[PDB]
A = this chain, B = another copy of it.
């Protein structure tokens, strides 16, 4: 197949984390599929279909852990697959792909703004909020509560190794929200003065577990210890349909040089291994609520998000498959 450069550039930017955050990479995969359709020089519907299947595979094969990315490719390709199998012609297939993409992209932006509005109602004037990493869904909550005139302060953990906490601190301070920045190790010491914890999600399992930036689970554990509400802000496309049939979520392991730069690491001896897990798993018993664009749920109702929106698709193979 004849795959446009934008697909390759996107895939590479997803792998290197220059595009990152679970929602954003989903949107960038949809965007990529959209541009593959726009720019295609295919003549038959079969030729375009083949390009879209292949582009989908390229994109799925970037980062494994956040299910948002495959749920985006699905959203488009289920629609593209049904059209192509209904005998759709060229421009009818092209436009299905283009329009399914723009739809997911739009719904994603709206979902995040509605999570903002729902989550903000659980934030109370004077609250101190601890967060972790840089999650747009979590930030939408915090930004909206501040825009409602609540005087909040946010504790931002730095989030090693990639320092996403820096993105968050600058971003929240740019909306006029006072920020307290701390190392991750400090999360227990400050849990006592924290009122609410608000974090994002890469994937959410059928039993209510949340897979999110390495460290999330420690924050949630001491939050529970202290009876501080742990709220997860997560779009419905963070829920992981394959876990309904027993699948485990793979934990991405990333380059040791994100932890120790190459210039330093090369001088270390062989007998030191550097392990760099990008996510950990937080059990549902340590999560108060999940805030989706459809409302507040206990973490144990993740199975209902799944049954009602994705469970249909599990009896079929992946839409980009043969």
Residues of A bordering B, CB below 8 Å: 117-122, 124, 158-161, 166, 169-170, 173-174, 176-190, 192, 206-208, 213-215, 217-218, 221-222, 225-227, 243-248, 251, 259-260, 268-269, 271-277, 280-281, 284-285, 288-289, 291, 295-298, 300-304, 311
Contacts and interface: CB of A to CB of B under 8 A. Distances in A.
Given A158-B259, A221-B222, A298 B303 contact: yes
Contact of A177 (B217, B271, B298): B271
Nearest to A178: B271
Given A118-B246, A227-B226, A245-B295, A184 B181 contact: no
28 contacts: A118-B246, A119-B246, A121-B247, A121-B248, A158-B259, A160-B184, A169-B268, A173-B272, A176-B271, A178-B272, A181-B273, A183-B276, A184-B215, A187-B218, A188-B221, A189-B217, A189-B251, A189-B280, A206-B289, A206-B295, A206-B296, A207-B297, A208-B298, A218-B218, A218-B222, A227-B227, A295-B311, A304-B304
A214 B227 contact: no
Given A117-B246, A226-B227, A246-B122, A207 B289 contact: yes
A118 B245 contact: yes
Contacts of A158: 160, 259
Nearest to A251: B189
Question: Which of A121, A166, A295, A297 is most buried by chain B, counting CB atoms within 10 A of its CB?
Answer: A295
Nearest to A161: B183
A268 B173 CA distance: 9
Contact of A179 (B178, B247, B272): B272
A218 B221 CA distance: 9
B222 A225 contact: no
A93 to B, nearest CB: 33
Given A188-B218, A218-B222, 16 more contacts: A124-B248, A158-B259, A173-B269, A174-B269, A178-B273, A179-B271, A184-B185, A185-B218, A186-B275, A187-B218, A188-B221, A207-B289, A221-B222, A226-B227, A297-B303, A298-B300
A113 B274 CA distance: 29
A207 to B, nearest CB: 5
A166 B227 CA distance: 30
Identify which of A189, A281, A284 gathers the most chain B CB atoms within 10 Å of its CB. Answer: A189
